[PDB]
């Protein structure tokens, strides 16, 4: 049950690039979470795009021997932290194929220097307790004003030429 | 914006033609001939001024546009459509900063 620096980085980055709309993304492990994906922003109570995103990311992650094992949502309003039906459904669907996946919701009422992890473990996604350098990395890159070249999936559906893996940010944080 | 200069040149030349022709007319009424027509040069000058001026004013007149609505919808996405400015609310993450 580990937090990867780049995961948190991409996560809060997506949270900041669309700061007045609710967002979800998706963590991919091979429990160690290994890479975040920003996929959507907007309404999010609509299946088809979600269904095809899940399918495509499966077809692609098999090639590198990764499985998803992880969700995260971040509501639009700051003063709210509650696992709305949608995320519950998506995490019960992911745990039908993994049976250990964990749900995340960022508090967002601090949003500077946050996590609220749940876990199902036969319970309705109940809470747990807190388990650095990545914080510094986050702060620096945020003030680096770089979130404007972070592509999500919703962008990919308009301009196919993007790359939802965005390895530029990966190598960038690697240099730090 | 060279077509503007083209039009101003046509106008200037046309005015020069009008001046030349007025003074020629005065010559006519002064020598009491009142038989002859205008010299060719003036005619050619004014006519070319006219043609050139039209060819330039057509360009600078403006530009046509399609009458098929969806032409201007080719480049557009939900992000513009969704905002609804008259229903804005600010109790969100940005107020942190
Ligand atoms: C304006 C459109 C272009 C006008 C064409 C033009 O140019 O009309 C010719 C006149 C001639 O000009 P003038 O006074 O030297 O000869 C006359 C002097 N006279 C009468 C005392 C002997 O122009 C003028 O003066 C008319 C002045 C008013 C501008 C028209």
From Swiss-Prot, chain A:
Tissue expression remark: Expressed in liver, pancreas, heart, lung, kidney, brain, skeletal muscle, and placenta. Expression levels are highest in pancreas and moderate in heart, skeletal muscle, and placenta.
CDD domains: MPN_UPF0172
Keyword Endoplasmic reticulum set for record: yes
Disulfide bond annotation, renumbered to this chain: none
Record has Membrane as a keyword: yes
InterPro entries to which the protein is assigned, alphabetical: EMC8/9, MPN
Keyword annotations from UniProtKB, A to Z: Endoplasmic reticulum, Membrane
GO biological process: protein insertion into ER membrane by stop-transfer membrane-anchor sequence; tail-anchored membrane protein insertion into ER membrane
Residues of the MPN domain: 1-124
PROSITE patterns cross-referenced by the UniProt entry: MPN
Membrane topology: Peripheral membrane protein
Pfam families, per database record: UPF0172 (PF03665)
GO CC annotations on file: cytoplasm; EMC complex; endoplasmic reticulum; endoplasmic reticulum membrane; Golgi apparatus; membrane
Localization: Endoplasmic reticulum membrane
PANTHER family per the UniProt record, alphabetical: ER MEMBRANE PROTEIN COMPLEX, ER MEMBRANE PROTEIN COMPLEX SUBUNIT 8
Subunit structure, interactors included: Component of the ER membrane protein complex (EMC). EMC8 and EMC9 are mutually exclusive subunits of the EMC complex.
Protein purpose: Part of the endoplasmic reticulum membrane protein complex (EMC) that enables the energy-independent insertion into endoplasmic reticulum membranes of newly synthesized membrane proteins. Preferentially accommodates proteins with transmembrane domains that are weakly hydrophobic or contain destabilizing features such as charged and aromatic residues. Involved in the cotranslational insertion of multi-pass membrane proteins in which stop-transfer membrane-anchor sequences become ER membrane spanning helices.
Homology family: Belongs to the EMC8/EMC9 family.
Protein's name in the database: ER membrane protein complex subunit 8
Native organism taxonomy: Eukaryota, Metazoa, Chordata, Craniata, Vertebrata
Gene that specifies this protein: EMC8
From Swiss-Prot, chain B:
Subunit structure of this chain's protein: Component of the ER membrane protein complex (EMC).
GO annotation terms (biological process): copper ion transport; magnesium ion transport; protein insertion into ER membrane by stop-transfer membrane-anchor sequence; tail-anchored membrane protein insertion into ER membrane
Record protein name field: ER membrane protein complex subunit 5
GO MF term set: cobalt ion transmembrane transporter activity; ferrous iron transmembrane transporter activity; inorganic cation transmembrane transporter activity; magnesium ion transmembrane transporter activity
Chain ranges passing through the membrane: 1-19, 41-60
Species, as recorded: Homo sapiens
GO cellular component, one term: membrane
Function per UniProt: Part of the endoplasmic reticulum membrane protein complex (EMC) that enables the energy-independent insertion into endoplasmic reticulum membranes of newly synthesized membrane proteins. Preferentially accommodates proteins with transmembrane domains that are weakly hydrophobic or contain destabilizing features such as charged and aromatic residues. Involved in the cotranslational insertion of multi-pass membrane proteins in which stop-transfer membrane-anchor sequences become ER membrane spanning helices.
Domain of life: Eukaryota
């Amino acid at each position: 049950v580990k937090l990867t620096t780049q995961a948190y980085c991409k996560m809060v980055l997506h949270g900041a690039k669309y700061p007045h709309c609710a967002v979800n993304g998706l963590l991919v492990a091979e429990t160690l979470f290994v890479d975040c994906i920003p996929l959507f922003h907007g309404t999010l109570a609509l299946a088809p795009m979600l269904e095809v995103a899940l399918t495509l990311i499966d077809s692609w992650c098999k090639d590198h021997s990764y499985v998803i094992a992880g969700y995260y949502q971040a509501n639009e309003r700051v003063k709210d932290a509650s696992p709305n039906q949608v995320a519950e459904k998506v995490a019960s669907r992911i745990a039908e194929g993994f049976s250990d996946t964990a749900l995340i919701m960022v508090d967002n009422t601090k949003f500077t220097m946050t996590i609220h992890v749940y876990e199902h473990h036969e319970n309705r996604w109940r809470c747990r307790d807190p388990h650095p350098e990545a914080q510094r990395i986050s702060a620096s890159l945020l003030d680096s004003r770089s979130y404007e070249t972070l592509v999500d999936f919703d962008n990919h559906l308009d301009d196919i030429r993007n790359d939802w893996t965005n390895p530029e940010i990966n190598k960038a944080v690697l240099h730090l | 914006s060279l077509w503007k200069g083209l039009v101003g040149i046509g106008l200037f030349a046309l005015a020069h033609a009008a001046f030349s022709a007025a003074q020629h007319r005065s010559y006519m009424r002064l020598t009491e001939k009142e038989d002859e027509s205008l010299p060719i040069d003036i005619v050619l000058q004014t006519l070319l001024a006219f043609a050139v001026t039209c060819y330039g004013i057509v360009h600078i007149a403006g530009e046509f546009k399609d009458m098929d609505a969806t032409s201007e919808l080719k480049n557009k996405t939900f992000d513009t459509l969704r905002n609804h400015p008259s229903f804005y609310v600010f109790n969100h993450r940005g107020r942190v900063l």
